[PDB]
Amino acid sequence: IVGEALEYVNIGLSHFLALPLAQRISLIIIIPFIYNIVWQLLYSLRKDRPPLVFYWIPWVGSAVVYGMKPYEFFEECQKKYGDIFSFVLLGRVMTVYLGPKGHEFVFNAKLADVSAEAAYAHLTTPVFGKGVIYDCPNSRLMEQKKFVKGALTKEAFKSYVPLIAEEVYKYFRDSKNFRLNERTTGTIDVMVTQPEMTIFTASRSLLGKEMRAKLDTDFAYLYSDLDKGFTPINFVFPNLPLEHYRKRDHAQKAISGTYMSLIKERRKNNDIQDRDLIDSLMKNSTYKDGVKMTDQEIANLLIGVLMGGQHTSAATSAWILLHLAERPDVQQELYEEQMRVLDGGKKELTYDLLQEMPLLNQTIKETLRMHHPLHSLFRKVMKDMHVPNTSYVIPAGYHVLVSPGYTHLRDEYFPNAHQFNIHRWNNDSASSYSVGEEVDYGFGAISKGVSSPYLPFGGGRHRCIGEHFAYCQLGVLMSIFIRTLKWHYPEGKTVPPPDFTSMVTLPTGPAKIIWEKRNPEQKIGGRH
Numbered sequence: 001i002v003g004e005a006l007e008y009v010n011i012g013l014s015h016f017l018a019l020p021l022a023q024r025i026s027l028i029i030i031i032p033f034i035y036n037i038v039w040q041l042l043y044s045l046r047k048d049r050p051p052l053v054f055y056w057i058p059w060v061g062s063a064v065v066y067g068m069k070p071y072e073f074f075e076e077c078q079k080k081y082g083d084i085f086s087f088v089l090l091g092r093v094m095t096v097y098l099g100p101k102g103h104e105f106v107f108n109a110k111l112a113d114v115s116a117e118a119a120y121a122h123l124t125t126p127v128f129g130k131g132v133i134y135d136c137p138n139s140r141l142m143e144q145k146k147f148v149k150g151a152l153t154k155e156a157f158k159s160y161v162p163l164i165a166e167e168v169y170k171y172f173r174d175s176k177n178f179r180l181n182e183r184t185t186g187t188i189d190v191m192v193t194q195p196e197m198t199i200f201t202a203s204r205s206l207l208g209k210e211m212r213a214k215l216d217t218d219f220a221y222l223y224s225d226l227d228k229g230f231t232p233i234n235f236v237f238p239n240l241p242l243e244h245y246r247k248r249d250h251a252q253k254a255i256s257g258t259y260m261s262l263i264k265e266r267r268k269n270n271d272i273q274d275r276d277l278i279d280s281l282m283k284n285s286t287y288k289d290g291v292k293m294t295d296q297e298i299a300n301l302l303i304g305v306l307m308g309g310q311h312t313s314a315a316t317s318a319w320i321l322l323h324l325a326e327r328p329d330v331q332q333e334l335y336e337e338q339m340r341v342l343d344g345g346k347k348e349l350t351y352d353l354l355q356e357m358p359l360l361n362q363t364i365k366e367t368l369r370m371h372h373p374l375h376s377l378f379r380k381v382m383k384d385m386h387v388p389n390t391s392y393v394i395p396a397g398y399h400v401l402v403s404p405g406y407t408h409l410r411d412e413y414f415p416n417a418h419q420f421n422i423h424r425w426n427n428d429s430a431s432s433y434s435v436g437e438e439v440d441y442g443f444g445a446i447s448k449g450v451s452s453p454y455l456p457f458g459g460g461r462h463r464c465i466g467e468h469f470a471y472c473q474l475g476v477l478m479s480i481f482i483r484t485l486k487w488h489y490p491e492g493k494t495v496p497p498p499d500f501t502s503m504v505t506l507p508t509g510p511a512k513i514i515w516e517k518r519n520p521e522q523k524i525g526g527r528h
């Protein structure tokens with residue numbers, strides 16, 4: 001009789017409920033652990049799914065090894081399963097597509113197939129504020145990028161260069177890390193100096209003199225507070241009743257308030273010029289459907305732009321210094337270019353003269369190859385995607401993960417990829433260049449193909465608009481570093497490994513270099 005079997009399901013259920021809590025809280029952990037191992041083995045038999053990396057702890061997935069060393073994880077996975085493979089990350093399924101075909105599959109994915117804001121909104125909305133970037137539909141983001149880029153013109157760059165140069169020299173004069181009028185040599189942590197130099201140069205040029213003046217006050221602490229809110233933790237715990245979260249949110253309110261204060265005072269005096277990004281968004285932030293951005297949204301977009309460029313740029317100048325510190329040959333070669341292009345230093349550095357410095361630009365270009373600030377770019381898959389020339393279907397609710405930074409470091413696309421060699425870019429010093437046809441998603445013509453193995457600024461609709469600002473900033477900064485200082489490592493030190501757990505792939509610190517003045521008796525003028 002099978003009826004007697006069902007009685008014993010009932011009985012056995014009643015006996016299960018009566019086991020000691022030693023056994024039951026055992027069995028609450030044992031049952032999903034074994035059910036997970038069963039589900040994976042069954043999953044491995046589906047041929048319409050990319051291979052899934054095996055993991056033990058349910059939900060947590062491969063998070064630990066991915067988070068700590070993602071390029072090593074990808075290379076081991078790539079040897080095992082080829083270029084397309086999935087792995088489980090703190091509750092989500094990430095499908096990785098390595099190589100140029102992966103750049104194409106993700107960066108050029110149809111707007112209806114994937115969503116960046118669905119992957120990213122919790123990462124950034126708590127830090128930037130509401131209504132901008134990833135807290136708004138894609139069509140709003142596109143036009144927001146059009147607004148910001150409209151202030152990022154070559155004529156803006158010609159005016160930013162002397163301003164950035166003034167900040168770099170101010171920092172050499174006044175910062176405790178240098179004091180070039182009092183000290184001719186010294187030790188700095190590049191992960192202390194570069195964030196400060198970056199925010200000082202970016203504030204002065206994009207935000208204007210008033211906002212730059214605030215960082216000389218206690219207001220600087222709010223920037224520090226807000227900056228600590230910029231962490232990948234926000235992926236999992238975006239809001240918590242802790243203290244870190246309170247100063248972050250306070251700082252966002254306080255900083256966006258200072259921006260709205262300045263915006264509302266410029267409009268009441270009609271003090272609206274072409275000075276900085278604030279003027280620019282004030283004159284040009286009405287969407288095509290007629291909606292104006294609010295003063296709050298404009299301020300929030302300013303925080304997003306300044307914050308993103310802060311961490312990519314600061315990490316990149318740190319890496320440039322760290323690589324050059326063990327390459328006095330490269331510093332020497334860069335210095336000769338500076339003497340030739342600037343008539344032994346008797347020409348004032350201009351945006352135009354920066355474009356005549358191919359080796360300096362190639363040094364930035366090579367640093368960005370070896371240290372892509374963003375090792376992984378995410379999209380949430382919104383409807384099922386067929387992976388061309390496979391039987392693979394990526395179902396909706398998965399995520400796709402693209403990693404041009406991994407391809408940057410492959411010998412097949414960059415011979416001797418782990419060697420720093422700026423001369424691999426000889427007669428190719430452009431920050432990037434569209435290898436053919438262009439398309440415009442709402443913020444300007446950009447390259448249509450994204451199959452280049454070198455993609456420091458991504459591609460497609462979510463492509464960076466900061467590239468020329470970053471090269472302007474990095475170029476002025478490194479031109480002055482080169483002309484002012486030599487530097488090298490403390491004894492037995494070398495290039496640190498990256499910190500992949502962070503918001504960008506910044507160097508693991510402290511990472512110290514010893515600078516020395518090229519001209520001990522050179523003084524920097526001005527009052528302090």
Ligand code: HEM
Binds near residue numbers: 310
């Ligand atoms: C060397 C410096 C930088 C590098 C390597 C870099 C890299 C990138 C990458 C890879 C993306 C694509 C992200 C994705 O597909 O999810 C991106 C997007 C973006 N970046 Fe940058 N960035 C840099 C500096 C800047 C600067 C200086 C700014 C602003 C002044 C900026 C603002 C933006 C914006 C607005 C986006 C658009 C994101 C979207 O539309 O989804 N970045 N950047």
Ligand SMILES: O[C@@](Cn1cnnn1)(c1ccc(F)cc1F)C(F)(F)c1ccc(-c2ccc(OCC(F)(F)F)cc2)cn1
Binds near residue numbers: 309374377
């Ligand atoms: O793409 C950024 C960064 N940026 C900065 N400049 N250019 N791009 C961004 C985009 C637009 C902005 F307005 C401001 C931004 F900061 C971003 F949206 F925040 C962003 C997206 C993803 C990531 C990121 C993705 C994956 C990560 O994995 C590491 C982890 F496994 F979580 F530990 C860590 C970080 C970081 N920043």
